[PDB]
Amino acid sequence: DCFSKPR
Amino acid sequence: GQGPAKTMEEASKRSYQFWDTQPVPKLGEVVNTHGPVEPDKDNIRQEPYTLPQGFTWDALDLGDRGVLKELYTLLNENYVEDDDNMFRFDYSPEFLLWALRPPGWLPQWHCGVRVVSSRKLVGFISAIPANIHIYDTEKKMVEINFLCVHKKLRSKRVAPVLIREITRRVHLEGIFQAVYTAGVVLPKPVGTCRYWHRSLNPRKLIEVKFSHLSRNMTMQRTMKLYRLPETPKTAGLRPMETKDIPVVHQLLTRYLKQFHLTPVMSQEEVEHWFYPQENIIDTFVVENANGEVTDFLSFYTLPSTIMNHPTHKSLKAAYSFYNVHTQTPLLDLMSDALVLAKMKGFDVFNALDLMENKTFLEKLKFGIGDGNLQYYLYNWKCPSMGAEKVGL
Ligand SMILES: CCCCCCCCCCCCCC(=O)SCCNC(=O)CCNC(=O)[C@H](O)C(C)(C)COP(=O)(O)OP(=O)(O)OC[C@H]1O[C@@H](n2cnc3c(N)ncnc32)[C@H](O)[C@@H]1OP(=O)(O)O
Ligand SMILES: [Cl-]
Numbered sequence A: 001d002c003f004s005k006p007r
Numbered sequence B: 001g002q003g004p005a006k007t008m009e010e011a012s013k014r015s016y017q018f019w020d021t022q023p024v025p026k027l028g029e030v031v032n033t034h035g036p037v038e039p040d041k042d043n044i045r046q047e048p049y050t051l052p053q054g055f056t057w058d059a060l061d062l063g064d065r066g067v068l069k070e071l072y073t074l075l076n077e078n079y080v081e082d083d084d085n086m087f088r089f090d091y092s093p094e095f096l097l098w099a100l101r102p103p104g105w106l107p108q109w110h111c112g113v114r115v116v117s118s119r120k121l122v123g124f125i126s127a128i129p130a131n132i133h134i135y136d137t138e139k140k141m142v143e144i145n146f147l148c149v150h151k152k153l154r155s156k157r158v159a160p161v162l163i164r165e166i167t168r169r170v171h172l173e174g175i176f177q178a179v180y181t182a183g184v185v186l187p188k189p190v191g192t193c194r195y196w197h198r199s200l201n202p203r204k205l206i207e208v209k210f211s212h213l214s215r216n217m218t219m220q221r222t223m224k225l226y227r228l229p230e231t232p233k234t235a236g237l238r239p240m241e242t243k244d245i246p247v248v249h250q251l252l253t254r255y256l257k258q259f260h261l262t263p264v265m266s267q268e269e270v271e272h273w274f275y276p277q278e279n280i281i282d283t284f285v286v287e288n289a290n291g292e293v294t295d296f297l298s299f300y301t302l303p304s305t306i307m308n309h310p311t312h313k314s315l316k317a318a319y320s321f322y323n324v325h326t327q328t329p330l331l332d333l334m335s336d337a338l339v340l341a342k343m344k345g346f347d348v349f350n351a352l353d354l355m356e357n358k359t360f361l362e363k364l365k366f367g368i369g370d371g372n373l374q375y376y377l378y379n380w381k382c383p384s385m386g387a388e389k390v391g392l
Helices: B008-013 B065-078 B093-100 B158-172 B202-207 B219-225 B242-258 B267-274 B330-343
Strands: B055-059 B087-089 B110-115 B121-134 B137-149 B178-182 B191-199 B237-239 B261-263 B281-287 B293-301 B304-306 B317-320 B348-352 B367-378
Touching (some): B055 B121, B065 B093, B110 B158, B242 B261, B242 B281, B281 B330
Parallel strands (some): B137 B178, B317 B348
Antiparallel strands (some): B055 B110, B087 B304, B110 B121, B121 B137, B121 B261, B293 B317
């Protein structure tokens, strides 16, 4: 996994 | 120290001084064939690649408690962050043993870099064996994960050394292809998947600024939007047990045949990857009125440290793993997954748009994320695929 947060 | 690209158009400007030397397709090269980029080498370099002065190789025995602690600390302080330096993954020691010691793990594939004078751990990269189905080919490969360079070592070309050295150590075992993922664009993605996020505790997520309030939406409105049932609804949902290992393997094997990039798990691998370990991996099977297991859902635990917030220290995230349905609608199965993660105290439920996830992401109130997961093959040339064909 890499990092993501809600757009 | 020219930096990484996040979109393909950003990748168009860049030149890849290292990846241009590697057996991977060039970006923009249209691929209409299936096979290795180069033939297998039948004589392999015996000597480790040269590190810059003052650094040395050391294979990490993760069975040594102190050594496993050194690795957790390196990753806890230097691994994947968000762009705004607010969250960093918090891989636990038991999670690292789960991810880094599956069946067939090899000690030389836990490849660390230490400072010569102090023995301080400042670099790492790992391989685990993985049988990979890619289109019409099943091949023994490795999966490369946990590439990490200490922040004080950044932009000094240490990652190319780690990549070449783990390549050499894999070549020694007779394997010439690898699969890996990354949030940056490199030559050349075989598939691009997008993260989606299902808020479980919206108040905390907004407090620590993981998510934000919608333009005209209040906190009270948001909490009501994401409110879940208190208990699951699928008949016969229960945690996976030892007796379910065979049928879970059977369900997963048949289910993955419809995608184009999937792992091929032995029954021992299914046991390792799916048998529940608290705060690591949860698997729930559906046992029907006849006593037969027809579906299962699974998600793993990966918390993130919150860098600077006065009241919250850890973001507890669940990541969708594999979800197989034959009798329970996938929408019902993933709805129960959200409820089970909510009951277990998770703050957010993360999933990618791969496999059939697009069929339920919007309907279960997932919101699109700003991060992609790029899928890659090393030394294998094949056409790209849409996210719905990625099953890895
Ligand atoms: C057959 C067996 C084969 C086995 C090998 C299969 C391939 C394995 C491939 C690895 C699979 C990894 C899977 C995971 O673990 S993905 C997780 C990666 N880890 C992190 O993002 C943690 C935070 N970042 C770091 O620790 C460092 O910034 C890293 C180590 C990422 C780069 O260190 P640094 O910032 O100090 O840079 P440099 O000066 O040393 O080196 C610059 C070169 O590195 C290329 N680069 C940058 N990021 C990545 C990346 N994420 N994958 C592959 N290459 C990457 C970059 O484009 C440039 O090449 P080019 O642009 O000149 O061409
Ligand atoms: Cl080990």
